[PDB]
Design a protein around this ligand. Structure first.
Ligand code: ALF
Ligand SMILES: [Mg+2]
Length: 929
């Protein structure tokens, strides 16, 4: 229940109803810190360095500088708050750029923005303008009182919906009371009542209402009253609340961080047990050693990950090959690189929503958009037999339809609830015989060409019906006075009823193999007496025997490079589905034309109360009851195609895919009917370029068309995941190698592992001397963007998870064991460990560590930019010139010795030769392609 008086401004303006302001931002000022801190310190690899930093509050676990465990905690906090604060303010900016659209109010007498709009203000909404909210039509410009709303972004439909004005109020200006029902999720239902003076209640239904993101057509203006606004709209109530999205690589790093924590705890317990359980405080010893060993990985890993994600977002949204792309969730730029299931969409996403009669065929010959001059000079002769057949074909095309034309200064406009008829009439005017003035209530039609304006008053029309697949007319010519029966329809229905032709089925199948929506057309000459016998009066008499004029091939235009995009996304192992709110037949035609369904490849179909093609109710019931069995059936099919899908159904399909397989689900679309599919995905991609952009606003990414998703997945996300995995590898390697050097020094000399690197040296290793070459790895790629099309199978090589797994983590751990043991033990061997050779020993150990990391960085580079050859030399020279001036106390030594440099050469060659030879033999055994 909801009662609306158009004139009582204060009662709705001040309160009682939601404002039209829509919000995409997640965190407000009051709950920006608690929510972000809570959802950031749920995982282990964050809570771990938080506990490491909080350990030093107790004045017994102090390992070193307080300027080393609290300033990187403040740095990770600063970076996190900055990133999500920038994300929220950018979301607010993007959302307010579409909350300021100007709409004219009857009472306010001035154009006001959409957010200023409330419930119950009469908007004079015009033709090409996007509908503001859930409107109810109280008056229409046309005397009939009907207009064609356009819901390609309310649901996935491609036809125009005939919405009539309220018949009691379309003549009226006076104030008219509305009383609607409470808002629901029913996108195809409406229950309201229009109340006038003297208690005259009237019915309202879906046929006299406009909704949130519809676009008007078939008028010049119309007066409509807002009923549902803001979050009470049918659009915003078919949407589930968005949740935070943690990447898969985040989970992998969390798991390997858990195992790393277990490893360093075991190493610390081993160190203390080997010491001898002395000092009367063994628990303090194991805790202090654990803090020592686990304070260089868990916090450097986070800063490296966060700044790498920022770099990935900047690289994505600054690509010339993908213009005008926007990253709206910067926390997951690497889920794009491991996507196994793609949930695409048809209307706007795949198609241009612009159908056009591509091909006409008759008498075993065909005309196309190419060579339209021949058919033009054929029709211009209206005022051997092939010319007459073509002329009568064109006449039947231009008369049999249900298209309403209306006039401007020029560029006459067509208005039909079936846009294939609009494509037909546009084709006829392009050939030369144009539709003009049509009554459509009385009996009249006007048609002018290069000659004289004809006229054909209709005699009867049989409306198009969903169970009939036919549109038939009886028409009377003015000039020649001839009764004609003209019918167009589907192949399956008119094939048995048109004639005894010999060539229908072949050409119908031939063009249906190209995804053309074919309609066959037949003609029957009539005289008067049979017509008055007909008018004496079920459907048997009206269709007896026709003559096949020909058939029409109407294509649904696809977006730029859709078939190639689908071919390469399936060549990379991504199983493209296609869920749509449109009709079954148009979905099948788009699937065949886009080669989502290839040659042959029999298609099954389900409609309940190889390939697949299922209705919405059938899929909903199947996922409600038969989850596991049906889903295990469908995962082996190449493509599953769904039709008539509620947004909840697409969201549930994405949820079921990411739950029953544990794979990552991308979901591309546009318009608000696939917002839930986008928010409940693991990656949400939106598309812009038309009147509606509301799915791109709520999405995680945004691209201008469908061709851009190929390079958004195959090159940007794949590189993002690869670079993040290699970054985690190198950070954990440097932390583990310093931990191993300290542990080897502790076993070889019973003092402490803490007493090896004290003061400046440990801080400099953690931050100054090592952090730049990892971000050097952040800017590396194996194959260029120009060759991400030729090699889609590279996207298949990341399918297993052979980059961040337990096996490769333990390979890193074993490499760290080997190299740290070599560094520490050869340092002890060359420096002859005592209490006076400690400085030289720690000097050679630290220099070996630094150069070892800088060589291991330079070993794992595919292509060398100039932003990586300089950030290694910069750090190496910083270490070289940072020994005397900033150190001088720690690790002091002579270092101007020929034997020292040979010892360093040996201690580094033994550490970097296994890695180099392993990658050499692995490159000579498994060449890449
Ligand atoms: F664009 Al659709 F269902 F194909 F919303
Ligand atoms: Mg849509």
């Amino acid at each position: 229940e909801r009662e609306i008086h158009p004139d009582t401004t204060p009662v709705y303006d001040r309160n009682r109803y939601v404002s039209n302001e829509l919000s995409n931002a997640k965190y407000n000022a009051v709950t920006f810190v608690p929510t972000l801190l809570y959802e950031q310190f749920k995982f282990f690899y964050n809570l771990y360095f938080l506990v490491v930093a909080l350990s030093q509050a107790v004045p017994a676990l102090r390992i070193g500088y307080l300027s080393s465990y609290i300033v990187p905690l403040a740095f990770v906090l600063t970076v996190t708050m900055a990133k999500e604060a920038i994300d929220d303010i950018q979301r607010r900016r993007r959302d307010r750029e579409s909350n300021n659209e100007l709409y004219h109010v009857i009472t306010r007498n001035r154009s006001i923005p959409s957010k200023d709009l409330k419930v119950g203000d009469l908007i004079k909404v015009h033709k090409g303008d996007r509908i503001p909210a859930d409107l109810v039509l109280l008056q229409s410009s046309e005397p009939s009182g009907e207009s064609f709303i356009k819901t390609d972004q309310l649901d996935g439909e491609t036809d125009w919906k005939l919405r009539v004005a309220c018949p009691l109020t379309q003549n009226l200006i006076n104030r008219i009371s509305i009383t609607a029902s409470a808002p629901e999720k029913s996108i195809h239902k409406f229950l309201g009542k229009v109340t006038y003076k003297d208690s005259t209640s009237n019915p309202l239904s879906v046929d006299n209402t406009l909704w949130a993101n519809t676009v008007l057509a078939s008028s010049g203006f119309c007066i409509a009253c807002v009923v549902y606004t803001g979050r009470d709209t049918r659009q915003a109530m078919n949407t589930t609340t968005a949740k935070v999205k943690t990447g898969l690589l985040e989970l992998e790093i969390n798991s390997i961080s858990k195992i790393l924590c277990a490893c360093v705890f075991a190493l610390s317990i081993l160190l203390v047990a080997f010491a001898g359980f002395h000092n009367d405080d063994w628990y303090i010893d194991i805790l202090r050693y654990l803090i020592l060993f686990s304070t260089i990985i868990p916090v450097s890993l986070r800063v490296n990950l966060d700044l790498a994600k920022s770099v990935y977002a900047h690289q994505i949204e600054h690509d010339k090959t993908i213009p005008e792309t926007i990253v709206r969730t910067s926390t997951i730029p690497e889920d794009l690189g491991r996507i196994e299931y793609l949930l695409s969409d048809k209307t706007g996403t795949l198609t241009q929503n612009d159908m056009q009669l591509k091909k006409i065929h008759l008498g075993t010959v065909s005309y196309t958009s190419e060579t339209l001059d021949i058919v033009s000079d054929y029709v211009q002769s209206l005022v051997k037999d092939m010319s007459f057949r073509v002329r009568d074909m064109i006449l039947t095309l231009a008369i049999c339809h249900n298209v309403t034309p209306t006039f401007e200064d020029d560029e006459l406009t067509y208005q039909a609830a079936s846009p294939d008829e609009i494509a037909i009439v546009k084709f006829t005017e392009s050939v030369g015989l144009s539709l003009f003035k049509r009554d459509r209530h009385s009996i009249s039609l006007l048609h002018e060409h290069s000659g004289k304006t004809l006229n054909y008053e209709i005699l009867q029309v049989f409306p198009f019906n969903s169970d009939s697949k036919r549109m038939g007319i009886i028409v009377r010519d003015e000039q020649l006075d001839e009764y004609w029966f003209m019918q167009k329809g589907a192949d399956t229905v008119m094939s048995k009823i048109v004639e005894s032709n010999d060539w229908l089925e072949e050409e119908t199948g031939n063009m249906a193999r190209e995804g053309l929506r074919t309609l066959v057309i037949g003609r029957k000459k009539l005289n008067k007496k049979i017509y008055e016998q007909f008018q004496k009066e079920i459907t048997k008499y009206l269709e007896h025997d026709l003559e096949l004029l020909g058939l029409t091939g109407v294509e649904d235009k696809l977006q730029k490079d859709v078939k190639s995009s689908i071919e390469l996304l399936r060549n990379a192992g991504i199983k493209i589905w296609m869920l749509t709110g449109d009709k079954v037949e148009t979905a099948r035609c788009v699937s065949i034309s886009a080669k989502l369904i290839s040659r042959g490849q029999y298609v099954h179909t389900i409609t309940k109360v190889a390939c697949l093609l299922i209705d919405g109710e059938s899929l909903g019931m199947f996922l409600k009851h038969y989850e596991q069995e049906f889903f295990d059936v469908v995962v082996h099919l190449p493509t599953v195609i769904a039709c008539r899908c509620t947004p909840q159904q697409k969201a549930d399909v994405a949820l079921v895919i990411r739950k029953m397989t544990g794979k990552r689900v991308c979901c591309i679309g546009d318009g608000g009917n696939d917002v839930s599919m986008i928010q409940c995905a693991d990656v949400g991609v939106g598309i812009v370029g038309k009147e509606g952009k509301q799915a791109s606003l709520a999405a995680d990414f945004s691209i201008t068309q469908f061709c851009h998703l190929t390079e958004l997945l195959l090159w940007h996300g794949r590189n993002s995941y690869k670079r993040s995995a290699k970054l985690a590898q190198f950070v954990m390697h440097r932390g583990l190698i310093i931990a191993i050097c300290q542990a080897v020094y502790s076993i070889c000399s019973l003092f402490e592992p803490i007493a090896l690197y004290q003061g400046w040296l440990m801080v400099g290793y953690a931050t100054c001397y090592t952090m730049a070459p990892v971000f050097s790895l952040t800017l590396d790629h194996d194959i260029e963007e120009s060759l991400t099309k030729i090699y889609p199978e590279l996207y298949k090589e990341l399918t297993e998870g052979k980059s961040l797994s337990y096996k490769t983590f333990f390979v890193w751990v074993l490499l760290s064991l080997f190299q740290g043991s070599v560094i520490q033990l050869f340092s002890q061997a060359f420096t002859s460990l005592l209490d006076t050779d400690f400085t030289r020993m720690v000097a050679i150990s630290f220099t070996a560590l630094v150069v070892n990391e800088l060589i291991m960085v330079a070993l794992e580079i595919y292509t060398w930019n100039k932003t990586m050859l300089v950030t290694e030399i910069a750090t190496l020279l910083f270490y070289i010139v940072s020994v005397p001036f900033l150190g001088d106390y720690f690790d002091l030594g002579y270092m101007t010795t020929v034997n020292y440099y040979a010892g360093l050469l040996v201690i580094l060659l033994i550490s970097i030769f296994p890695v180099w030879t392993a990658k050499a033999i692995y490159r000579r055994l498994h060449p890449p392609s």
